[PDB]
Nucleic acid binder design. Structure first.
Ligand SMILES: Nc1ccn([C@H]2C[C@H](O)[C@@H](COP(=O)(O)OP(=O)(O)OP(=O)(O)O)O2)c(=O)n1
Ligand SMILES: [Ca+2]
Lengths: 352, 933, 353
DNA sequence: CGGGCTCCTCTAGACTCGAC
DNA sequence: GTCGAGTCTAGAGGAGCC
């Protein structure tokens, strides 16, 4: 309730105060996301990409269109599994037909609710049938660890083994929202049924190589809702302070100006701003605002956002180079040399 | 009847103006003089030609003080220069106590009493000073320290940026960062323009009564040297006449001190801490640097003592000194559009340089593949480069399993990381690449490192080989002795510059590329501007084809000026005035920008830095005019008047042409138009395109600007080969035979058309003490016939007319100052580019300024006629053709300065509208012919 | 023709010869892009974001949905301008109603061809004060043209042309000179305020922005860029068969390989270098994992077609001194470099490019 | 016999200083 | 003790102005 009001006010969620609700957010029928929300979702997508596609040769990006043409006229995609299955043959050549390999994509999927749009991170893992459950448990552990890694309260991320109508093994990952537990990710041991359906006959094309022998794969679908995951992280992160993990926080450091002279301090702040941008540290350009508010009010505003640190430049910075630094996690103020700020921020982000 | 005609029917001045200027009493020419003039003009076919009279001008001119015009100018110049000669004489009789044993380490001005006691003062408080300013170049253009002297006082100045250490100082200068030095005052220095630019009160929009004398200017006036003379002097320190060496020196304070005072040699600081040292270096060696600055000031004082009487003897007319005083207070207003222009010009230059470097780097990267198989020995361009190679010198899984594997991999990688002990401590520069490619790439230690052969440009001798440039289907080849050229295959052991045999390239002939200056010059770059017509014709071609060659030459032409002038323009010392320092008129004006910045650039002009006593400024006397294709050519257009102000100025029409013509006429007979050249000069209107420049530009299809070069070369000793080469360069449709024919046509009649002028110039040059015909200024000692005999003859012959033009400038400045002071015109001197005077005037007094300029031109021409004893002035040369009233400095008031860096023009990118050019009649209609308010 | 063959061979394009045609590529009815094509488009979008949003203090991201509901059934989006105009009022508060400010977004728009063609578009909507609308239009034209020429081996092929709408509004259109002709890759329109007034009828108090000391209704400057057509333009511009893509745009930066025996011992060093480079933001192709070993010439040709900047060859001699052979696509020259400084060299080469 | 200036980049040559 | 990467300087050719 209050968290949604903060998110709407601090530009995590777009629309009017009466235009957002729990069901609309969960179903994908919200008007959209604010710039801070877009940046948080992009950070989540980058972290997911780093954890899945990066550091793994077998995982490759895939590009599935938003619509499926031909007879089922056309209709919007509902899941990202079909595109990967259609790309199974083309992507087989990259690994020289060596199982296992996977295709990952973070794209918007359309679900009939009204039409709802969810940003879903899907992993389609082509597995030899022998180690299907072993890889399924491996992915379960890795995804649960990834969800708990950024969580201040990792106990709120749960898991539950489930069986579908066909009796295939599957595991569901949840998040414990204050109202209740909501599904954010699901894994299923689908098997070769869908692959054979999309590729009937001539199983020679579907054959790969598993220990120098040709074996048709068993697919594993790891589908997670990044929008609902973003809501879960926002709820976990929430004194009106949103303690988002530094790898996920949209804006790292806030840059402001003290007293006069205006031009010199603006030049210094612009130089520091350009330096931090060149070093990959997102900064809120708070020094451009001619109107100024109280320091406590500015601190509260930056804490409502996921601002890691606030940097204030004054005449003393011109005299000796010291900048006021405040930490979001602990309300402590320290003086730091202006040439050491970049290294401190990079070290903090890397350590986190 | 205001219409008047001389015995030669040339329309002379209006009757009222003639009465107010010359008056009744002029001696009649006489029958013999008129007969000679008529016979000459009839023989040269100019006697019977009628010309439509120009409309008469009736002006109530300001009263002239003396009995004649010469006395009037003398009285004006004496009134102008009287308060400053007094200060100069005060300096010449100065008793100064010895310099203090220890200099004061305190910010600001400190006065050293007797025995060295240091007393803090706000300003030196002197009518005369010898000033020297030291600037720490590492921290920018802000002054660091300075020492000044006066009768019975030593002064020292220190800045906050020297005595205080702080993290950051403002890079945008303000008057509060300068030296406070400011009823009349005189400041003497060896480059006093440099020291003027560091004075706080010299950047106010309103003028100041402080003037500046320069020992370099007086040295060039008394015993100056020409550039050829300077080269010979420096060579000899390390033509059968060499007596001028002992009475001349170069424009260095040590050498001037040796020449005039001749004491112990002047000592300089060996480390050069200001040019190439940090502020800490100056802080550690403060006393030594202060001592050296004091030594320089003392040397300048002694030099000025030895020079002032000599200058006053060799330049006795007060107008010379008054003009020198007025020529050293230049002022160029600017605004934030200056910063915008710098940024945009740098960005466009970087973009064009980056396109050129992309092309060249692609050609270089693709060329490295010829190393394989030694295929470079078959490339007709890159076979001569060094393709040497340098050897390299030397002295599923579980979570626990995954963690263990990651740790093992990281530790194994770290184990091989520690083998850096065996690596040499000096990183080798690209051992695996060929040497020619090695030289084109920045080293990794370079802070400005850019991948690829970034150190590559059209000026490098490998670029034509990379682009595979061909001249008439022959590959370009470079000879160390004969510059660039091309190889014509067919040698066993085509017509062009010549088959030089000093190259000995097997199976080839070396022909130099044709040069615009003849066969005695070498081509150092095939990408010169003169090769664009040859590139378009098809004789010069690039290997990749298409537009690669033409685009390269086009970009070179676009960025050629900015390449050579970006350090000068960007480093201009701009001091931005705050709102308090601005006048109320600027603030209250509708065009005032509250968020804008207003400042000025003071040109660092040496008033007399030429043997002809011309001014010198590295940037603003070199500033290019706006062109559609030149990057940064809108430089002068960025000199923009503040709100409520306009730049009213004018340019003299055919200055040296008319000076030569009037000299020749006065030498022939005491009338205007006696000679054919003088008659031609008067009979012609620039509005109708009948002047000599336009007549030449019509006779030969060159432009009028090129006709200027042609005519002035012909006047000052250019031969027929020079004219032919100039015509071929400027008119690409001509042939060798046609250029020779047109050279003869312009040289056929010059008992000739211009014989009397040449005789007068040679007579003045060969006299015992050559002097200016108007103001009597003497030539330098190093050019008198006793010193040099028959050497540098062309230099002295041109010096006559050029120093006459400098006298014209002096007279114009004196008259403009007199008119502005008499009638209270709220304007001031902006800049004088030789014969172009520009004045920053308020909008309410722009037409009055135009009328004052016209009256000034009239009086100056009348003075030129009077000192030659002509007693009359033709109506044609009486007034300016047009006086510009514009808010920015540009050659024409209508041109919108559209450049590659300013494609939208001044009217769109900025708020500057088009100006207006007005002749005398429009000015009279707009101000009723009166300079009063 | 040969460029398309190389692109589909190296998985820039994922389709057969039936769909890989000029008309299908330009229209947007082609199948999805191959993994290298996806990486190239990601790099292009990252460069666009760096140039437009990150280094501009007035540009913020905007989330526009792929469908517009309401008036009867909804439709897919054909442009990103509608969502940006819907978010204009909400994003006015970020800049504290200070103009100019922009809303930038990269996303897929649906265009009828009634076949549906999907085009990924990068759109910037600049809310400029009315008096400086032409100045900002010229500035953005120059900036976008310089951005397109920044990664271009042939900057002259990216041209501009002045055009006007039926209503007469000024605008510019950027093109890339493809071998068949010029194609519209980016469009700039100096729209007034009537579109915002249509979307926001009533009092114009909300739409007022701060132009200095005056409140004005902003003029909408729409800059729309086709990232798919831009990727095709860069593929043609880059094209010894080698796709000389820009170092900041190349999909895979470096390639790792094993030189000689022993096979097992070099694998640990290759894994360590692989993990280090991936931790340092450098995409690596693991060529040491290929069982079917091939000659170095074929590997070099394959990496040239894939636009691989560097080929690191960890050998048995690296185990002794730590020197790894390094070859570059640009010069095809071999160099020796120590393990300790490979990451720094790669980062420097990527950043300074 | 154009004159009077200005400054730049590029390259060769001589000198210096640290590393093997 | 030799030798190669910086480093300063001088000279040549090009290019702006009046
Ligand atoms: N190439 C040149 C250019 C100029 N001058 C000298 C002669 C001129 O008298 C003086 C001023 O140059 P201008 O360009 O003003 O030449 P004019 O005054 O003759 O032309 P205009 O009538 O356009 O002012 O400089 C010269 O000797 N050679
Ligand atoms: Ca002139």
């Amino acid at each position: 309730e209050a968290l949604l009001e903060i998110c709407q006010r601090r530009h995590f969620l777009s629309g009017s105060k009466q235009q957002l609700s729990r069901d609309s957010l969960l179903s994908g029928c919200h008007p959209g996301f604010g710039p801070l929300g877009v940046e948080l979702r992009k950070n989540l997508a980058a972290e997911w990409w780093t954890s899945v596609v990066v550091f793994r040769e077998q995982v490759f990006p895939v590009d599935a269109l938003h619509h499926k043409p031909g007879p089922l006229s056309g209709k919007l995609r509902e899941n990202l599994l079909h595109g990967a299955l259609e790309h199974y043959v083309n992507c087989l050549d990259l690994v020289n037909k060596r199982l296992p390999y996977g295709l990952a994509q973070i794209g918007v999927c359309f679900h009939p609710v009204s039409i709802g749009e969810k940003t879903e991170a899907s992993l389609v893992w082509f597995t030899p049938p022998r180690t299907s459950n072993q890889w399924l448990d491996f992915w379960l552990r890795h995804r649960l660890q990834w969800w708990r890694k950024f969580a201040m309260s990792p106990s709120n991320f749960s898991s539950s083994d489930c069986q579908d109508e066909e009796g295939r093994k599957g595991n569901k990952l949840y998040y414990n929202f204050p109202w209740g537990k909501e599904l954010i990710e699901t894994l299923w041991n689908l098997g070769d049924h869908e692959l054979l359906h999309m590729y009937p006959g001539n199983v020679s094309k579907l054959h790969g190589r598993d220990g120098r022998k040709n074996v048709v794969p068993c697919v594993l679908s790891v589908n997670g809702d990044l929008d609902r995951g973003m809501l879960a992280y926002l709820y976990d992160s929430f004194r009106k302070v949103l303690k988002l993990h530094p790898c996920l926080a949209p804006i790292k450091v806030a840059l402001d100006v003290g007293r006069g002279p205006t031009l010199e301090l603006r030049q210094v702040c612009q130089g520091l701003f350009n330096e931090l941008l060149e070093n990959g540290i997102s900064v809120w350009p708070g020094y451009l605002e001619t109107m100024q508010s109280s320091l406590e009010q500015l601190y509260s505003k930056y804490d409502e956002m996921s601002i890691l640190f606030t940097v204030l430049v004054t005449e003393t910075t011109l005299e000796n180079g010291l900048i006021h630094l405040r930490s979001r996690d602990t309300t402590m103020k320290e003086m730091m040399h202006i040439s050491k700020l970049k290294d401190f921020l990079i070290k903090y982000i890397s350590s986190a | 009847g205001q219409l008047r005609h001389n015995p030669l029917d040339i329309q002379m001045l209006s009757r009222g103006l003639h009465e107010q200027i010359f008056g009744q009493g002029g001696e009649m020419p006489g029958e013999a003089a008129v007969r000679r003039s008529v016979e000459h003009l009839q023989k040269h076919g100019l006697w019977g030609q009628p010309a439509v009279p120009l409309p008469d001008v009736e002006l109530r001119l300001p009263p002239l003080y003396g009995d004649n015009l010469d006395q009037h100018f003398r009285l004006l110049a004496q009134k102008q220069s009287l308060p400053y000669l007094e200060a100069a004489n005060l300096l010449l009789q100065a008793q100064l106590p010895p310099k203090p044993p220890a200099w004061a380490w305190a910010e600001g001005w400190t006065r050293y009493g007797p025995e060295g006691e240091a007393v803090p003062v706000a300003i030196p408080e002197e009518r005369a000073l010898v000033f020297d300013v030291e600037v720490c170049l590492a921290e920018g253009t802000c002054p660091t320290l300075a020492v000044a002297i006066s009768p019975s006082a030593w002064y020292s100045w220190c800045s906050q940026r020297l005595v205080e250490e702080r993290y950051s100082w403002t890079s945008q200068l303000s008057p509060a960062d300068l030296i406070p030095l400011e009823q009349e005052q005189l400041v003497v220095g060896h480059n006093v323009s440099f020291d003027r630019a560091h004075i706080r009160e010299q950047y106010l929009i309103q003028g100041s009564r402080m003037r500046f004398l320069d020992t370099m200017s007086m040295h060039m006036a008394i015993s100056g040297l020409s550039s050829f003379q300077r080269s010979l002097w420096i060579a000899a320190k390390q033509i059968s006449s060499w007596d001028w060496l002992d009475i001349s020196s170069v424009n260095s304070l040590a050498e001037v001190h040796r020449l005039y005072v001749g004491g112990p040699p002047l000592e300089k600081e060996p480390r050069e801490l200001f040019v190439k040292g940090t502020m800490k270096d100056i802080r550690e060696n403060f006393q030594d640097l202060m001592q050296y600055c004091a030594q320089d000031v003392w040397a300048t004082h002694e030099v000025f003592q030895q020079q002032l009487p000599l200058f006053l003897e060799r330049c006795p007319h007060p107008v010379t000194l008054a003009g020198m005083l007025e020529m050293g207070v230049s002022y160029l207003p600017v605004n934030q559009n200056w910063e915008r222009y710098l940024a945009e010009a740098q960005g466009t230059y970087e973009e064009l340089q980056r396109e050129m470097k992309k092309s060249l780097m692609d050609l270089a990267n693709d060329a490295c593949q010829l190393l394989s198989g030694e295929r470079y020995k078959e490339d007709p361009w890159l076979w001569d480069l060094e393709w040497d190679l340098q050897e390299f010198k030397q002295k599923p899984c579980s979570e626990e399993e995954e963690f263990q594997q990651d740790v093992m991999a990281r530790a194994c990688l770290q184990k091989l990381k520690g083998t850096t002990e065996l690596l040499p401590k000096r990183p080798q520069h690209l051992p695996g690449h060929p040497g020619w490619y090695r030289k084109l790439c920045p080293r990794l230690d370079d802070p400005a490192w850019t991948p690829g052969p970034s150190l590559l440009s059209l000026q490098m001798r490998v670029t034509p080989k990379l682009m595979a440039l061909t001249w008439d289907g022959f590959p370009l080849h470079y000879s160390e002795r004969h510059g660039w050229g091309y190889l014509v295959p067919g040698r066993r052991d085509h017509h062009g510059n010549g088959p030089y045999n000093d190259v000995d390239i097997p199976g080839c002939w070396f022909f130099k590329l044709p040069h615009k200056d003849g066969n005695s010059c070498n081509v150092g770059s095939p990408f010169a501007k003169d090769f664009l017509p040859k590139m378009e014709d098809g004789t010069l071609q690039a290997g990749p084809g298409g537009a690669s060659g033409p685009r390269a030459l086009e970009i070179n032409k676009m960025i050629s000026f900015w390449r050579n002038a970006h350090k000068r323009i960007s480093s201009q010392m701009v001091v931005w005035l705050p709102r308090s320092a601005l006048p109320r008129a600027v603030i209250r004006h509708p065009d005032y920008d509250e968020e804008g910045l207003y400042g000025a650039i003071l040109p660092q002009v040496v008033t007399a830095s030429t043997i002809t006593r011309r001014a010198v400024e590295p940037t603003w006397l070199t500033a290019s005019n706006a062109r559609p294709d030149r990057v940064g050519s809108e430089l002068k257009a960025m000199v923009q008047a503040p709100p409520g102000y306009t730049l009213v100025g004018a340019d003299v029409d055919s200055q040296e042409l008319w000076i030569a013509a009037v000299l020749g006429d006065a030498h022939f007979a005491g009338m205007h138009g006696c000679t054919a050249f003088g008659w031609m000069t008067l009979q012609g209107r620039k509005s109708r395109g009948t002047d000599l420049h336009s007549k030449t530009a019509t006779t030969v299809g060159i432009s009028r600007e090129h006709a200027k070069i042609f005519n002035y070369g012909r006047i000052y000793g250019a031969g027929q080969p020079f004219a032919e080469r100039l015509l071929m360069q400027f008119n690409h449709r001509l042939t060798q035979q046609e250029a020779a024919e047109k050279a003869q046509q312009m040289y056929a009649a010059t008992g000739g058309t211009e014989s009397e002028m040449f005789n007068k110039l040679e007579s003045i040059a060969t006299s015992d003490i050559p002097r200016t015909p108007v103001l009597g200024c003497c030539i330098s000692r190093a050019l008198e016939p006793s010193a040099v005999q028959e050497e540098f003859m062309t230099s002295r012959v041109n010096w006559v007319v050029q120093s006459s033009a400098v006298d014209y400038l002096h007279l114009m400045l004196v008259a403009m100052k007199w008119l502005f002071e008499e009638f209270a015109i709220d304007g001031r001197f902006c800049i004088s580019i030789h014969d172009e005077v520009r004045y920053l005037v308020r909008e309410e007094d722009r037409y009055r300024a135009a009328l004052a300029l016209q009256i000034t031109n009239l009086l100056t021409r009348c003075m030129f006629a009077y000192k030659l004893g002509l007693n009359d002035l033709p109506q044609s040369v009486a007034f300016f053709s047009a006086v510009d009233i514009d808010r920015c400095l540009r050659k024409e008031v209508t041109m919108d300065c559209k450049t590659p860096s300013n494609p939208t023009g001044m009217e769109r990118r900025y708020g500057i509208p088009q100006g207006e050019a007005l002749d005398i009649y429009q000015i009279i209609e707009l101000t009723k012919g009166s300079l009063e308010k």
